[model samples]
Target: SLPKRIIKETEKLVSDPVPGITAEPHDDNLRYFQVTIEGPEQSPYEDGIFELELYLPDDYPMEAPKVRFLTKIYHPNIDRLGRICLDVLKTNWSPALQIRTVLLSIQALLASPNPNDPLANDVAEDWIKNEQGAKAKAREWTKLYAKK
Candidate 1:
């Protein structure tokens, strides 16, 4: 049986949606979900829609859920495998945090791509070398890979 915590959160997710974010759990598997995040305005990813996947294990809440981008994105914090380098998903996680919190933080991360603390080395290097060029490239990739 699933925990009461998961059930409550799942219900809240449906009843009260997060802004610019959508998380839909699989009908066959409650612990697995499909996610969509709208890009932040003024950022290179603005107006784009990014897809991601989330999974909660048996030890969830005690341990953070695993999330990975399913769509290709050009960002310093996202690796080739679509894995993100974010503190909340790693070291900064807390059991009190909700799934919506994590996704919102990811949206913020997209608004401000942190090259100093990066997952993709080349992308970070480019961001540091020429921020404008990096943003332009990201915009191009967003246009090619993501949709409004």
Candidate 2:
């Protein structure tokens, strides 16, 4: 029963996919998915393809799915473990949202990072004091970690 909705959502994602993102369910377990999001243009993450792992919880839709980036990213809101500090993944999550929406939000996050509320405080501090330097570091990290 739980997997049915997930299956439908996944099918829709594959059938009418988002422009810069792709998700593929594992052959062994439908609950696990591999995701890739292309960096939005004009952002420090541009031209980088970041990989993420997603798992649907038993109480998904009621509780948000668990997601973590597999590739390293240098961003104020994303920690070393690739955990995101996004409100929608926490207090703001609602049942109406689905995988596509969450991924879209993540892509937008990469495009417009928020240093004010950050998981990586040092990165946020650097971003606040020296934006160009921060962007440069982010780009450098993207090239290092996100290539192929």
- TM for every model, in the order presented, reads 0.94, 0.94
Lowest summed lDDT window (length 10), candidate 2 = 116-125
The alpha-carbon deviation from the true structure for residue 82 of candidate 2, after best TM-score superposition, in angstroms, is: 0.3
* Candidate 1 regions with alpha-carbon error over 4 angstroms: 118-120
In model 1, pairs of residues that clash are none
Query: Across residues 12-129, which tens digit of lDDT does each residue of candidate 1 receive?
Result: 8878898988889977788999999998888999869999999998899989999999889989888888898888999989898989898888989899888887355578988998
lDDT of each: 0.88, 0.89
Error of 1 at 23 (Å): 0.8
Q: Please give, for residues 1-148, the per-residue lDDT of candidate 2 as tens digits.
A: 4568888998998899899999999786878999999988999988699999999888988999899999999999888889988889999998999989899999999999889873555689899899999999999999999954
> Whose lDDT is greatest here?
2
